[PDB]
Amino acid sequence: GDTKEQRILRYVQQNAKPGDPQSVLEAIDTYCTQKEWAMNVGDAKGQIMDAVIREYSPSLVLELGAYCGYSAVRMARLLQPGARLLTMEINPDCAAITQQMLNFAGLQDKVTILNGASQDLIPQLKKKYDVDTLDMVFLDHWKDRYLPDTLLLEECGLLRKGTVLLADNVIVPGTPDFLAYVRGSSSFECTHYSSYLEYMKVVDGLEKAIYQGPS
């Protein structure tokens, strides 16, 4: 049976160029804006993500909620040799799509895909995936999970001073609990990056929260 996610992957494989991550991004953004709507960060927000990666040049990045691999491709393509992306995806079919997307783009050796729930996998990073601390975390999974997974990252000792959290959809549909906590806590230095959801004709935004150390 055909699914939307399989259709996205097929469109990329037909029209993008293997080993060319930029063509893969353009293909997905074309597909989602012109052929069939899908959950997608999109190019406007993508350029903010690009800027953050280039500013902090993280060596170890954790992504929560890979879906079809658009953001994994977006970030992994800007990573240096020896840098790693760890990405978590709760849905097995989407995890498979993400793998094929990264393989097509030529980035499969920079990325480890973890199939499971954030709250189960996050406490295993130190022991099983040889993580000390994370340089960057991109949050784009279930919205009611942003605040508790941030708290769990902190108590698992995965954040250090200077670790960048970047969270999507904090306005639409909105994560006001997360926002209240990080903006109000002295442990996080926060900035907001507005971006228009053109298809929905409403403004959304990404929050950047830089860990400052425990309170």
Catalytic annotation, residues = 140, 143, 168-169, 198
Of 79, 92, 159, 91, the residue nearest 122 (C-alpha): 159
Q: Give residues in contact with Na ion (CB under 5 A).
A: 140, 168-169, 183, 185, 188, 190
Minimum gap (Å) between residue 19 Cβ and ligand 6OZ? 25
Q: Of 84-92, 130-138, 164-172, 202-210, which segment contacts ligand 6OZ by CB under 6 A?
A: 84-92
Residue 194 buriedness (CB in 10 A; 0-12 / 13-18 / 19+): exposed
Residues 97-136 that bind ligand 6OZ (CB under 6 A): 117-118
Residue 53 site contact among Na ion, ligand 6OZ, none (CB < 5 to 8 Å, cut-off depends on kind): none
Q: Of 50-58, 61-69, 129-137, 152-160, which segment contacts ligand 6OZ by CB under 6 A?
A: 61-69
What would the two tokens of residue 118 be? 């954030």
Residue 71 site contact among ligand 6OZ, Na ion, none (CB < 5 to 8 Å, cut-off depends on kind): none
User: Hey, which residues does 88 pair with through a beta bridge?
Assistant: 64, 114
Among 6, 30, 33, 91, binds ligand 6OZ (CB under 6 A): 91
CA–CA dist 9, 7 (Å, integer): 5
Q: For residue 28, give the 3-state DSSP assignment.
A: helix
Minimum gap (Å) between residue 87 Cβ and ligand 6OZ? 8
CA–CA dist 81, 133 (Å, integer): 18
Q: For residue 145, give the 3-state DSSP assignment.
A: helix
Kindly provide the b/e burial profile for residues 22-40, where b requires at least 16 CB atoms within 10 angstroms of the residue's own CB.
ebbbbbbbebbeeeeebeb
What would the two tokens of residue 138 be? 């991109």
Residue 168 site contact among ligand 6OZ, Na ion, none (CB < 5 to 8 Å, cut-off depends on kind): Na ion
Residue 188 site contact among ligand 6OZ, Na ion, none (CB < 5 to 8 Å, cut-off depends on kind): Na ion
Among 32, 145, 163, 207, binds ligand 6OZ (CB under 6 A): 145
Q: Which residues bind ligand 6OZ (CB under 6 A)?
A: 64-65, 67, 88-91, 94, 117-118, 141-142, 145
